[PDB]
Amino acid sequence: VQLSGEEKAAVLALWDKVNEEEVGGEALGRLLVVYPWTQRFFDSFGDLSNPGAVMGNPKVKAHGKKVLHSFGEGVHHLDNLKGTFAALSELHCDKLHVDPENFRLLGNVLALVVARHFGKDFTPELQASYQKVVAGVANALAHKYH
Amino acid sequence: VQLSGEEKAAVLALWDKVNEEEVGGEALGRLLVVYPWTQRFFDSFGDLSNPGAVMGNPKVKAHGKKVLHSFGEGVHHLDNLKGTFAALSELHCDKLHVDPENFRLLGNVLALVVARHFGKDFTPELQASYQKVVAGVANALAHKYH
Amino acid sequence: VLSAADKTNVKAAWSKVGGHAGEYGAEALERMFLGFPTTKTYFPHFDLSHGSAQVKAHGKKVADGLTLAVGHLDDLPGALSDLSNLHAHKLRVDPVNFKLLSHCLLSTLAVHLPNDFTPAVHASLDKFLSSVSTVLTSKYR
Amino acid sequence: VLSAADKTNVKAAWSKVGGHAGEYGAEALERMFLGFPTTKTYFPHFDLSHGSAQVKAHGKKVADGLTLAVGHLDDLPGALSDLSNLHAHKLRVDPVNFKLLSHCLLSTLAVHLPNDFTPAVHASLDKFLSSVSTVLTSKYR
Numbered sequence: 270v271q272l273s274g275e276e277k278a279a280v281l282a283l284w285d286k287v288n289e290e291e292v293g294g295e296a297l298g299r300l301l302v303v304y305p306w307t308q309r310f311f312d313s314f315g316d317l318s319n320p321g322a323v324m325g326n327p328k329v330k331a332h333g334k335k336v337l338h339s340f341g342e343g344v345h346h347l348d349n350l351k352g353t354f355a356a357l358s359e360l361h362c363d364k365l366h367v368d369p370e371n372f373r374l375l376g377n378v379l380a381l382v383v384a385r386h387f388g389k390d391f392t393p394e395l396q397a398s399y400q401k402v403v404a405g406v407a408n409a410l411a412h413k414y415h
Numbered sequence: 416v417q418l419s420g421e422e423k424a425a426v427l428a429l430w431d432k433v434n435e436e437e438v439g440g441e442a443l444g445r446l447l448v449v450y451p452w453t454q455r456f457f458d459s460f461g462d463l464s465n466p467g468a469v470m471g472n473p474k475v476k477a478h479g480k481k482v483l484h485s486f487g488e489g490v491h492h493l494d495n496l497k498g499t500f501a502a503l504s505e506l507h508c509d510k511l512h513v514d515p516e517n518f519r520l521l522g523n524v525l526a527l528v529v530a531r532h533f534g535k536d537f538t539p540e541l542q543a544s545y546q547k548v549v550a551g552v553a554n555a556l557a558h559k560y561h
Numbered sequence: 562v563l564s565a566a567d568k569t570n571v572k573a574a575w576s577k578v579g580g581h582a583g584e585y586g587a588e589a590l591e592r593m594f595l596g597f598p599t600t601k602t603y604f605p606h607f608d609l610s611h612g613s614a615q616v617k618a619h620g621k622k623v624a625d626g627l628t629l630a631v632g633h634l635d636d637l638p639g640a641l642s643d644l645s646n647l648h649a650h651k652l653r654v655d656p657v658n659f660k661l662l663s664h665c666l667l668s669t670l671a672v673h674l675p676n677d678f679t680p681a682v683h684a685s686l687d688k689f690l691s692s693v694s695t696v697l698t699s700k701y702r
Numbered sequence: 703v704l705s706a707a708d709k710t711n712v713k714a715a716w717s718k719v720g721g722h723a724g725e726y727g728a729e730a731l732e733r734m735f736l737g738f739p740t741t742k743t744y745f746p747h748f749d750l751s752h753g754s755a756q757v758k759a760h761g762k763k764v765a766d767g768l769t770l771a772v773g774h775l776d777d778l779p780g781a782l783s784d785l786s787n788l789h790a791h792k793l794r795v796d797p798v799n800f801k802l803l804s805h806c807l808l809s810t811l812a813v814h815l816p817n818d819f820t821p822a823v824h825a826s827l828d829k830f831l832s833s834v835s836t837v838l839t840s841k842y843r
């Protein structure tokens with residue numbers, strides 16, 4: 270992963286226009302519907318039991334947003350990631366009890382929420398560069414677990 | 416993985432005395448018995464169909480040895496691995512057609528051939544340091560696939 | 562395993578795809594080729610590029626593959642006896658890449674089907690693609 | 703799936719372990735804790751150290767768990783209905799760590815059993831530990 274100066278202009282260019290909303294909460298809602306054993310770190314919230322309403326859900330939509338916003342600091346600092354993420358890697362271990370498998374799981378889903386938002390604008394060419402990014406993030410986040 | 420100056424003296428100290436024989440071929444034979452879909456890169460040889468004889472097998476025992484010998488240059492250069500392995504990473508892709516999943520698979524097996532050779536001498540303490548090494552090797556080997 | 566609702570959610574989705582099964586299946590083949598470098602290894606004979614009628618020809622016998630998997634969904638083991646005695650004896654394609662292809666089919670998918678790829682559906686489509694996965698994978702050890 | 707020979711190779715091995723099942727199972731629990739940092743996360747309540755009678759107490763109800771899995775090996779689904787309605791509803795332990803525990807039990811294993819852990823056996827022991835894995839894992843989606 271010593272990505273084209275380029276695939277950045279792109280992995281960046283596509284990113285610009287994640288109207289950071291609809292999008293984060295859909296990654297969010299799509300994850301607790303599909304891989305339902307992640308509803309575990311999240312009865313912190315409400316009604317996650319019929320998907321009309323995980324989606325229908327505000328605390329998710331809010332959580333949703335915050336996860337995506339903090340992913341974006343990643344996209345814009347894709348050089349020395351491990352650094353950007355270091356504190357939340359440090360926080361997601363000793364505070365949060367998150368199956369770091371659940372990170373790789375949320376990128377796979379994201380790269381699918383993304384795939385769906387773009388359609389024909391989300392390629393081959395581009396999916397390879399985001400599958401390059403997502404795993405990058407997951408492994409900077411996947412860090413200081415001891 | 417910025418391992419104790421120490422767990423080296425150990426991950427090294429335990430290594431010294433891989434009588435590099437019995438051992439490499441057992442990792443070898445144990446891999447094509449257990450995960451039998453790796454017999455694929457290997458009708459290059461002979462009779463791999465009843466395990467008495469994968470074991471019973473010279474071309475394996477030879478292959479066995481060569482894989483372990485080239486793992487040892489790894490153990491003794493565990494700093495900048497990615498470097499040591501770079502050429503064989505480069506060779507195992509464009510020449511060899513190896514499922515790089517089959518590397519992670521052979522470390523897991525090794526750390527088991529090792530576990531069996533030591534018994535009570537192969538700890539907790541020590542298994543953590545070899546599960547630290549094996550994955551290290553697999554990911555330096557796992558490199559320049561494009 | 563697959564609820565009535567699973568067998569269902571799956572049918573809407575596999576009948577939107579229609580006569581586009583191997584149009585999609587070939588562009589799912591491609592992105593795996595694309596996204597994972599790693600998998601192109603069970604393919605050194607194939608012309609991998611945007612061109613590859615070795616990939617579309619290939620990418621047809623796959624979706625041909627999943628079209629008839631929706632249909633014989635009660636008895637998936639029986640429908641796939643051969644096409645998994647094939648994956649096991651011969652091809653010996655490691656049970657790991659199956660998850661990478663299912664995610665390359667899944668996404669695929671999303672793109673040609675945005676409206677109808679709801680999420681009660683991305684969840685039944687993921688169950689089907691894993692079961693298919695598990696069947697193909699079975700005759701190993 | 704499991705050949706007669708599988709159901710067999712498995713029995714020699716699970717009767718060498720004997721009254722050491724939860725002696726081994728607790729020192730397999732430990733090395734997962736050890737080798738994978740990652741898994742200690744489904745355990746923030748437990749005193750993880752060499753001491754942990756929370757781990758041996760824990761590490762007993764597991765091997766207790768696999769002792770009775772050798773016995774009801776024809777019908778694994780039925781024997782494990784509860785102890786997997788448990789892994790799925792409540793614990794919701796991700797189906798990934800199962801492979802890390804099976805390899806921490808597998809190795810384990812090797813160490814107390816060098817002579818009898820032949821390899822026609824490391825292969826039947828790996829089939830059993832995966833099936834167990836798959837059963838526990840089932841009641842998910």
Ligand code: HEM
Pocket residue numbers: 307310311313332335336337339340357360361365367371372375406410
């Ligand atoms: C791209 C992946 C991830 C990123 C960048 C991310 C980011 C964040 C951020 C910035 C916070 C706020 C913490 C603070 O105020 O300092 C947070 C909280 C949290 N995250 Fe993560 N996260 C990721 C993945 C995950 C996953 C996959 C899970 C669970 C499946 C998870 C579970 C939690 C929980 C439970 C909280 C706290 C929510 C609460 O207060 O109830 N995270 N995350």
Ligand code: HEM
Pocket residue numbers: 453456457459478481482483485486503506507511513517518521552556
């Ligand atoms: C620790 C893991 C690995 C190491 C360090 C390693 C090392 C080596 C070395 C040094 C060679 C000799 C090539 C030369 O002369 O330059 C070789 C050859 C080869 N390796 Fe690897 N190897 C690893 C894993 C694997 C795995 C897991 C597979 C297959 C499952 C594999 C398949 C092959 C094959 C087929 C050859 C050629 C044998 C022949 O000439 O027929 N290797 N390896």
Ligand code: HEM
Pocket residue numbers: 600603604619622623626627644652654658659662693697
């Ligand atoms: C949806 C998943 C799977 C299905 C339905 C499936 C189905 C098929 C079918 C129908 C064929 C053609 C059989 C024929 O030649 O008569 C085939 C061939 C083959 N498949 Fe699979 N497959 C799946 C997954 C995989 C994966 C993920 C890979 C590789 C990582 C793979 C690699 C191969 C290879 C190498 C062939 C040989 C075709 C040739 O000679 O070029 N398959 N598959």
Ligand code: HEM
Pocket residue numbers: 741744745760763764767768785793795799800803834838
């Ligand atoms: C051989 C594999 C598995 C078997 C046979 C098994 C069996 C069991 C059994 C018998 C219990 C005790 C039930 C009781 O409290 O009445 C239990 C509890 C539990 N298991 Fe599993 N298990 C397996 C794998 C896993 C894995 C790999 C993990 C974690 C990664 C895990 C995490 C837990 C947790 C967190 C509990 C709760 C116990 C407590 O409250 O401390 N299990 N398991």
